Amino acid sequence: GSSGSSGRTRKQVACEICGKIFRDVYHLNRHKLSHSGEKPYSSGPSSG
């Protein structure tokens, strides 16, 4: 149930880690610093 004609075009950056909005990745690059660079999901081993 949806037309699929108009809507909010995605032309910006949005940090989901903390929940913020930015202009372009060029700005998010400096913001990522505050966050972690590597987030390995070690707490979740595979299974059958």
Among 5, 6, 9, 18, binds Zn ion (CB under 5 A): 18
Residue 44, by phi and psi: left (phi above 0), alpha (psi -120 to 50) or beta?
left
CB 17 within 8 A of CB 35: yes
The reply on whether position 15 binds Zn ion by CB under 5 A is yes
Closer CB to Zn ion, 3 or 34, in the complex: 34
The reply on whether position 17 binds Zn ion by CB under 5 A is yes
Q: Is 20 helix (H, G, I), strand (E, B) or coil?
A: strand
The reply on whether position 33 binds Zn ion by CB under 5 A is no
Residues that bind Zn ion (CB under 5 A): 15, 17-18
